[PDB]
Structure formats: structure tokens, C-alpha cells
């Protein structure tokens, strides 16, 4: 061979200075880049699709070795990401996709479908024999949403498990978390489990929960994110299992995806789906302490 990465200009493209997973994934990828000798910057741009073009098209212009992108909005950015790969920039889609191919060299992130089995079954082995389960999705059509929850209908098909109750929210908030539970539990008030696309959905449904006075951990709670808040309702009993995605780990696979090409010249696997874990009242403080978490979330 005789190819390096060793001096490579690399930008990674996200947005959100304040929310913590694309924090994390600029630092695990920050770490790596820093291993893999590379000249890595990220730009961070405002909340805007508008903005996150105007971001983009600007890294383009500078003529970068290599462009990764956590898109702010799938389809918005279609035209520009495109116009960045015509330009012969080789581009990475990181942790969310866009609404069609625009020949990226890569898609890396977590599997949605995945996600969405892991917590239906779950549920599923630790369910009473008559059990049932409600559903509380996010914003409908978002592809967060839509795959999990496709999976996980299907996991409780197969294992005979009635669902109740299948209502989409207008965004992942404790807010709407709560405001669906209080009516589900006014339909359905014996379900078994409540399936909630994120965490902050879930923390809104245990206050829901609570308020009918309704014993802790009587009906199971699963959500997504790992977050703090969840981590903590995990380990009291209140919460029965949240799933990381891992986005430290996800920031260090995109950069050595990108740095393993530009020294070799290889194409890499145009899906790499990124490791995730399952943290529940039982396995916590075990699952935290280990190895594969510190990769995970550092």
C-alpha cells in the first residue's frame, strides 16, 4: 500500500450545540480523528436546515478531503449533500440517513428496526400470561419512529401480545409522553407495558403513571436514549429498560471508516450499523461498569 489519512482535511457537519448526543459524537470522533492523525474540523450549525446548507455548501467551497454529516433534516438536504459528492467529495452520512441515496460512501448509525425488536421482546419475555401493551410513538413519518415501531409490532405479533393502544405524539417530549398516557390509562388502565419511542416520551409517562397512583414498576416502561433522567428511572425500578445508541462510538466508527478510505482507497460497506445497548433495572450498574459501555458512551 503506502497510503495515509496522516494530514487528511476532514469536516464533520452537525448542529445543536446544546443536545447532548451530537455533542458526544463530535467528541468520540474529535478522539479518533486525533489517533488517526487527521485535520479534522466540525462545524456546528443553529437549529436550521437552512443554516446546515449554508454550513455544508461552505465546508464544500474549502475542498475537503472528506465530509461527514449528521443531517438536520433528511430531505432538505438532499440537493446540497448531493452537490458535495458531484464535487467529488467523498461524503459520510452519520447517525440519521437523508430521504434518498445521493451516492454517499457511507450511512453509519444506529439500526432503528433493531432498536424496536430489542425492546418488544423485552417486553415480551417478562409480560403476564393475558398481558397487553400500549404504544406511544413520536412525529409521525420520522424515520426514528416509524422503523422502531414497525419492528416492534411485529415482535408482538409473533409472540401473541395485544396492543391496545398505537398513538403517534407530536414530538418526543414529556409533555406529549404524559398527556398520551393519562388517556391511554383512562381506555386501558390494566396494561402491561407502555412502549414509548424515546426517553423523554417515558419520563412524561411514569409522572402519568404515578399521578393514578399506579405501583412502580407495575407496568413496564421502555424507551430509547439513555439519557440521565432514564438512567435514573431505570436504576429506581420506575423505568424497565432504555437503549443507547452509543454516539460516542458512533463519532469514532465515522472517522475511521473515512481515514481506513482515504488511506487505502477501499469502499467501504454503504450501511455500517453502529452497536447499541440495552440497560435495564436488573443488568445496570453490571452493563455500566464494563468495557463495552466505556466504547459505547466513554
Known sequence: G?????????????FGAQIPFFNRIGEGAKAQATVRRLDFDI??????????????????????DGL???????????????????????????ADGLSEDVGQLSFVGSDFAEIGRLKATYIAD???????????????????????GEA???????????????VYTKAITPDEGLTATQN?????????????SGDDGALGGIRAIAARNIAPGKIMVVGTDANEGALAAVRA??????????????????????????????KPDRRIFTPVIEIDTETIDRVMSGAAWERCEN
Open 237 to 266: 425500578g420506575t423505568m424497565a429498560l432504555t437503549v443507547s445508541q452509543c454516539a460516542y462510538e458512533q463519532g469514532g466508527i465515522a472517522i475511521d471508516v473515512m481515514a481506513d478510505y482515504l488511506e487505502t482507497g477501499k
Open 126 to 148: 417478562r409480560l403476564g400470561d393475558g398481558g397487553t401493551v400500549a404504544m406511544v410513538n413520536g412525529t409521525r413519518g420520522m424515520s426514528f419512529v416509524e422503523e422502531q
Open 43 to 64: 462545524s456546528t450549525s443553529e437549529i436550521d436546515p437552512g443554516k446546515q446548507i449554508d454550513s455544508i455548501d461552505n465546508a464544500v467551497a474549502q475542498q475537503p
Open 68 to 94: 461527514i454529516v449528521s443531517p438536520i433534516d433528511g430531505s432538505a438536504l438532499v440537493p446540497t449533500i448531493k452537490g458535495a459528492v458531484e464535487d467529488g467529495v467523498p461524503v459520510i452520512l452519520l
Open 184 to 196: 391511554i390509562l383512562t381506555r386501558h388502565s390494566d396494561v402491561g407495558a407502555i412502549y414509548y
Open 2 to 14: 503506502g497510503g495515509s489519512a496522516a494530514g487528511k482535511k476532514v469536516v464533520y457537519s452537525t
Open 152 to 166: 416492534a409490532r411485529e415482535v408482538f405479533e409473533e409472540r401473541g401480545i395485544e396492543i391496545v393502544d398505537d
